[PDB]
């Protein structure tokens, strides 16, 4: 565990993270995909051996000794708002189980289902609150990675508001 477990946010490529493991915003078939998933495939391609896993689950594959936690959020194009919300919450609970099992002191995590799986909706608050619900009982330092300048400010505000 971290001595004073924290949340932080950085605006940069999660493939350049400074944490002990990474969460991939994976597809269920273990395909290279787009966005975060394509960057993770380019940096840790060995971690896509038998990485396929259902929606709402996380599966860890080692790249050398570096753990890649493949977390499959729902594609809100295909799910109802209600069912998608349940699967998005479930994916983050499985990430917390993996982070705990691995014994890491830090984890790099993207906001699941906020990009090409968002169904064209802004899901920053929905995805972030499911992240907190899952990770708050863990003692790893959590570093959230984003792309958008306005998202960085909104994530930073949500973190600071609970300190
Ligand atoms: C990196 N993608 C996250 C993101 C940024 N912006 N939005 C967004 C904003 C308004 C309406 C729909 C979607 C999602
Ligand atoms: Cl970058
Ligand atoms: Cl996404």
Curated annotation (Swiss-Prot):
Domain of life: Viruses
Membrane topology: Peripheral membrane protein
Domain Macro: 4-163
Effect of residue 27 to R/Y: Almost complete loss of mono-ADP-ribosylhydrolase activity
Complex and partners: Interacts with mRNA-capping enzyme nsP1. Interacts (via C-terminus) with host G3BP1; this interaction inhibits the formation of host stress granules on viral mRNAs and the nsp3-G3BP1 complexes bind viral RNAs and probably orchestrate the assembly of viral replication complexes. Interacts (via C-terminus) with host G3BP2; this interaction inhibits the formation of host stress granules on viral mRNAs and the nsp3-G3BP2 complexes bind viral RNAs and probably orchestrate the assembly of viral replication complexes. Interacts (via C-terminus) with host NAP1L1.
UniProt: ADP-D-ribose binding residues: 13, 27, 35, 115-117
Protein name in UniProt: Non-structural protein 3
Subcellular location: Host cytoplasmic vesicle membrane
Result when mutating residue 36 to E/F: Almost complete loss of mono-ADP-ribosylhydrolase activity
Cystine crosslinks: none
Function: Seems to be essential for minus-strand RNAs and subgenomic 26S mRNAs synthesis. Displays mono-ADP-ribosylhydrolase activity. ADP-ribosylation is a post-translational modification that controls various processes of the host cell and the virus probably needs to revert it for optimal viral replication. Binds proteins of G3BP family and sequesters them into the viral RNA replication complexes thereby inhibiting the formation of host stress granules on viral mRNAs.
PTM: Phosphorylated by host on serines and threonines.
